[PDB]
Amino acid sequence: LAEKRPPPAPRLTFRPADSAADVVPIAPISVEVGDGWFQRVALTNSAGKVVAGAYSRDRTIYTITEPLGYDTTYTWSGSAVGHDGKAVPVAGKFTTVAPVKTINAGFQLADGQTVGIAAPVIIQFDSPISDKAAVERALTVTTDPPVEGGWAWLPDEAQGARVHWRPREYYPAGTTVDVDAKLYGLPFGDGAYGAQDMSLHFQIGRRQVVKAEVSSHRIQVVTDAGVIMDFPCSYGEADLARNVTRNGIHVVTEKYSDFYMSNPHERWAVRISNNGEFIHANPMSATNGCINLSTENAEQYYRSAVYGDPVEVTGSSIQLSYADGDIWDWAVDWDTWVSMSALPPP
Template sequence: MPAAKINASPAFGTEDLSPAQPVVVKVAGGRITQFALTNPEGKVVKGALSADNTSWTSGEVLGYGKTYTATGSALGANGKAVAIKGTYTTVTPDTRVRVNVSPGDGDVVGVAAPVIVRFGTEPADRASIEKNVKITTTPAVVGAWAWIQHDDGLWALDWRPKGYWPANTKVHVEANVYGLKFGEGEYGADSVTSDFSIGRNQVVYANAKSYQIVVKQGCTAINDESSCAKTVATYKASYGRGDEVNDPNLVTRSGVHVVIEKLPVHLMIGSPPFTYRSTEYWDVRISDNGEFIHENPYTVDVQGVDNVSHGCINLSPESAKAYFDSALVGDPVEVTGTSVQLSDADGDLYDWTIPWSKWLTLSAL
């Protein structure tokens, strides 16, 4: 009759063990009768025996920079006991990489809001990180992850639906990266979760040639105004004058913008060659290249008639306040009728400028 043989994975004596790597102890030719893995303070690591008592698998992540001691025994088919003993030492990172998830807990966002899981460094092995980032939606929504470098220089995993989110969707995101290796000496600092929801469906249709914006709700398709259930409001507007004066720097970009933030008052400062400084009210930022929907009392006489701005969408004070109050971060603003397309050169949220077929190629899995 065979004696019990112990096999540990990773092998006992392993140093620089990732805290996220499961520990598995198996016995051939016998069964485990007793086993514990303890930390330096004597706390027993959670784990479970298999139904036939031939293996034990850890059930929680370990701590950084600690030595764990395995003790136990196995009974061989020959009736003789064999001791189980060994140690593991977990890695002490040089850098603990922090992770941020947006939207955050409790947020209510518009139907174009992407999920963004930002990392403090670019992972050397994207696939290993992406395998540990999960999303659950209620109801189920078709979507995909993509690796995107944002305008702060940081790499992120962005998830967006194939179409706009269904209204009132509940979303749960898990970035289980604690203990995962990002690069040499770099490991995940903490795992992060977020639970948020999608609000009502509202889309702004902004055709620069119409000199107005139209706010609609209950829209079921991207770039299809006819798919919307109702019109909420129509406001006279003035867009960027770039197409009129042949200056692409002054053109309001065409494409699906996303509301990034809402500022009741904001000091706008022009970048060279523009040197203006102007305090504006009811500002809804729709890109990071300086495009806002905001009030401008000085262009009211041409709103609905001509395009005269530096690239923003100007409304009257009354219209701007009404739109500001109705907007959610994450709402789509579909701009059409101009000569320059929105792109990654225009700021952080350019996810909707990427065709779905290409988006699917940006995952590491």
């Protein structure tokens, strides 16, 4: 009487497909239907935590907005209505990748920390890294004002790989810094995967430069206010190479009102290298390896020093090197720094 052909059943498309394994936890997750709309859709993990997602306006595509765990099986549930009014089930599952190890990371600065104009940004991993190149492309640095700088890999330590970021010149005073590392779901190398996304905000403090000419027996501290400290001092006399204040731009890191160090008890000490070079107080009259001040002067200097303040050392036979230990970043040419990037340069 009135004959014809039955019309369209809905057509579900899962990205990722049912029973997929080794799914990367930051891949795009979705279920798309055709010839019909979604009545309900929801995705849960093995423990029944509902994962937040979102429909498309047409309500024919559902998508996950938050990223997933590792080594976790997720399942789909819901229905989509066809032109019938016939509801059809939306049901499926997949398991995310389960890496050999999650490699972590951690900046050596805190959020909101205020530092000197030569502060490097140091990320320290808790493992070696096959694809250093890939971990780098995840990194982003934003400064205000904008400033030229660059990532660079140093020799893996006993904790693991490490990477430093350095602006080519000093930060302008007051510069805000915002660094972002998108490492979650990131294949570091082999079956190892990045622990988690990281981010850091910090600011550069007042411009303060130290001027330390070994032959002058003087040290100067210079700021926006001008020379604010000119002190007589004693440098390391180049008679034995254990006892020469190394040459080049140093960076202040630690400081102690009172410390006890059984070398390779200080007062008002400021560390300017992991080789054990300090600016501090000690009984003298101008030699050694440090930079000696009167107790009174060392105290004045000390109270003004700040993590990341540069100390310019000049006129010395022995350049500051990797051998001296962190921070040896500013004691190499920009081109050689750029060379240490795991990606090729502009």
